[PDB]
Structure 1
Amino acid sequence: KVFGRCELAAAMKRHGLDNYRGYSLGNWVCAAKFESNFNTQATNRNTDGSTDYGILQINSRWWCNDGRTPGSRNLCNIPCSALLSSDITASVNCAKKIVSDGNGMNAWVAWRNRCKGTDVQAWIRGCRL
């Protein structure tokens, strides 16, 4: 499923992402845009044998189990396929753990390169939250 910008913003605010760990909703919507382009089925293969899954591109080496990544940890304790669903619940719950793992939102490379230090409130413009 491909979310609309405000549609995703509403879903995220309901799951408690707004200002979570001091990161405004705009940061989360911006991260999702550049990580997966709002597509819940997005999967990207990394050259190290791991794969990023879903709307927030969560990694299979440390966060979810996909059964084919050497040295997997599965810290979110869920199969990576569950991060490819239409409802973002699983992805959000796992993202909450990742963000408080000592690196803030720097964990998401696309956020760091395209969202960090910018006017992120622009990502929630026109949305009725």
Structure 2
Amino acid sequence: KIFERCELARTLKRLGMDGYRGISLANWMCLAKWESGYNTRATNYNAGDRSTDYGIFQINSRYWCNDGKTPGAVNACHLSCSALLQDNIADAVACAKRVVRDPQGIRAWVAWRNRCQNRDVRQYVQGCGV
């Protein structure tokens, strides 16, 4: 599913993402926008290290979910990567929370540093009622 901006903002808010570990909703929206264009089915194979990024947050298989085909990979979110390809983003949100509980926080995603860090991200939640 490819979410519309405001519907995603509220969906994320209902799931407890607003201010989770100090991360605003606007930051999560900026992340999802740049990672997948708000697409839960988004996928990207990294031929360099044989891993794959899954879903709306493009979570990587090497450390976060199990796809059975990434060498020496672990599964920190304890989920099949398939769970990150559902229209319902609850499991993806649970995993994204797991990622940010680590030292780096939202910085785990390089795309967040590239396109959201020290940026005016207000526009992502404006008019959404969140």
TM class by shorter chain equals over 0.9
RMSD of aligned Cα (Å): 0.7
* In structure 1, distance between residues paired with 2:118 and 2:98: 22
TM-score (norm 2): 0.97
Q: Which amino acid aligns with 2:31?
A: A
* In structure 2, distance between residues paired with 1:33 and 1:18: 16
Q: Match of 1:81, SS?
A: helix
* In structure 2, distance between residues paired with 1:94 and 1:108: 13
- CA deviation map 1:11-49 (0-9, x unaligned): 000111101111110000000000000010000111210
* In structure 1, distance between residues paired with 2:76 and 2:23: 22
Q: Counterpart of 2:124? A: 123
Aligned residues: 129
Offset at 1:72? 1.1
Q: Which amino acid aligns with 2:69?
A: R
Q: Match of 1:63, SS?
A: coil
Q: Is residue 2:89 matched to residue 1:70?
A: no
Gapped regions of structure 1 (runs ≥ 5): none
Determine what percentage of the aligned residue pairs are the same residue: 60
Offset at 1:100? 1.2
* In structure 2, distance between residues paired with 1:110 and 1:72: 22
- CA deviation map 1:47-97 (0-9, x unaligned): 210000000011101000001000111111110011000011000001101
Q: Counterpart of 2:92? A: 91
* In structure 2, distance between residues paired with 1:97 and 1:78: 11
Q: Which amino acid aligns with 1:122?
A: Q
Q: Match of 1:29, SS?
A: helix
Q: Counterpart of 2:51? A: 50
* In structure 1, distance between residues paired with 2:40 and 2:91: 11
Q: Which amino acid aligns with 1:27?
A: N
Q: Counterpart of 2:80? A: 79
Q: Counterpart of 2:32? A: 32
